[PDB]
């Protein structure tokens, strides 16, 4: 099929576009989680821990 | 830490406001009334018995 291949190409474009949106968000999301749950946490906890 | 962190002061300095304790106690006691309102809900069930 050819028409369906063209429809598949549309799907591929939708996949790429949405994926990149998601990935872009992840690029900021993770760092923040690490800072929040690990870095900033122990930054304050350690004193009481020690 | 040197002044306040003593094992005796963990009982002394760490004394809760009674007014605060009573305020929250009342909230708990009203919640206990709502635990009693599970018997109201039991009564809700009982009203289906007729």
């Amino acid at each position: 099929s050819a028409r369906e291949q063209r429809d598949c190409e549309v799907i591929e474009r939708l996949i790429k576009s949405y994926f990149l949106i998601v990935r872009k968000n992840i690029q900021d999301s993770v760092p923040k989680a690490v800072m929040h749950f690990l870095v900033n946490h122990v930054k304050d906890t350690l004193q009481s821990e020690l | 830490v040197g002044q306040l962190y003593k094992s005796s002061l963990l009982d002394d300095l760490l004394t809760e406001s009674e007014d605060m304790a009573q305020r929250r106690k009342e909230a708990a006691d009203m919640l206990k009334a709502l635990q009693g309102a599970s018997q109201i809900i039991a009564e809700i069930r009982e009203t289906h018995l007729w």
Partner: protein
């Protein structure tokens, strides 16, 4: 009303202990043509001769009856609005006082007053309930009646049956044509679907011999959401001969078993009373989720109050160190100008 007395009392406390208003029971309003048996129906719901009764025209001035539950604080007594706090342990005086008061405004010549009579009845074996005894529907202006007395009484009926929160008892005599029941005809003006209207067929013992109301009772002629229930009760002679309830039951039961064997156990006044109890139970059931909803809402509120302190602290040491740390941190941050509290 029987076990409902303690059931309902428990179901008052369900509101008292949450700070809610107690569910109000629908107003009991009896409608129908003159001498259909209206007051008698209400009398069977009390057990006392509190209402006036008789042939032709009797009720000539709507009665507002407030049944009153009495606590453990006269065992049984009444009280009229127009006599303030006068207590009536004499329940014949009550009936007679209704008669007196009726004549005072409506008169004693078939005239009907638009000004109802308010009466409270007190007992520790009854539950709070509002009931209305209406004048019978008419067509001809007689005695002291106005040209539009039909419409006056119609409006007097509508005054009460127009309230969704009510039970309309369509009391019509068995020896009349139920298909023309004025009781139901006016009921349909405020309750066209019959959702809160119960069809009542009285004087089955006087029903025209050779005929029946099976088609009416079975909904073939008259469809009613609350069903159709027949009634047997005392005549002029049986009232004057003081026929007992047991005697009335025997005659009712035997008649009904001989008349409608299969419907006899639905017509049976006891069945009706139980049905009415069920209707009230349904009325109660309708708002039990609202009751439960409040319980849920309050719980969230009380937990929110509990969240105001969070915990009582069983760790002590770590808690203290954290409190110290946080203070010193923000203290030093305040020096820097880097405090969270800017």
């Amino acid at each position: 009303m029987e076990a409902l007395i303690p059931v309902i009392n428990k179901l008052q406390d369900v509101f008292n202990t949450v700070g809610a208003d107690i569910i109000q029971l629908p107003q009991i309003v009896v409608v129908g043509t003159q001498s259909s048996g209206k007051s008698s129906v209400l009398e069977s719901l009390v057990g006392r001769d509190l209402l006036p009764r008789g042939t032709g025209i009797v009720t000539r001035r709507p009665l507002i009856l407030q049944l009153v539950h009495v606590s453990q604080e006269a065992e049984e007594w009444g009280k009229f609005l127009h006599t303030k706090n006068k207590l009536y342990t004499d329940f014949d005086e009550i009936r007679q006082e209704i008669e007196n008061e009726t004549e005072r405004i409506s008169g004693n010549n078939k005239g009907v007053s638009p000004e109802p009579i308010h009466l409270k009845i007190f007992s520790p074996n009854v539950v709070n309930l509002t009931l209305v005894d209406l004048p019978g529907m008419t067509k001809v202006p007689v005695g002291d009646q106005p040209k539009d007395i039909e419409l006056q009484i119609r409006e007097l009926i509508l005054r009460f049956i127009s309230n969704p929160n009510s039970i309309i008892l369509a009391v019509t005599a068995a020896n009349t044509d139920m298909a023309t029941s004025e009781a139901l005809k006016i009921s349909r003006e405020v309750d066209p679907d019959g959702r809160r209207t119960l069809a009542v067929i009285t004087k089955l013992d006087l029903m025209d011999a050779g005929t029946d109301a099976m088609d009416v009772l079975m909904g073939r002629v008259i469809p009613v959401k609350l069903g159709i229930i027949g009634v047997v009760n005392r005549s002029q002679l049986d009232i004057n001969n003081k026929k007992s309830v047991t005697d009335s039951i025997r005659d009712e039961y035997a008649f009904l078993q001989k008349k409608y064997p299969s419907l006899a156990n639905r017509n049976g006044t006891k069945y009706l009373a139980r049905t009415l109890n069920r209707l009230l139970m349904h009325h109660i059931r309708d708002c039990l989720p609202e009751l439960k909803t409040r319980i849920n809402v309050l719980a969230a509120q009380y937990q929110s109050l509990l969240n105001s302190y969070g915990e009582p602290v069983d760790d002590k040491s770590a808690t203290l160190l954290q409190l110290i740390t946080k203070f010193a941190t923000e203290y030093c941050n305040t020096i820097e100008g880097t405090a969270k509290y800017i």
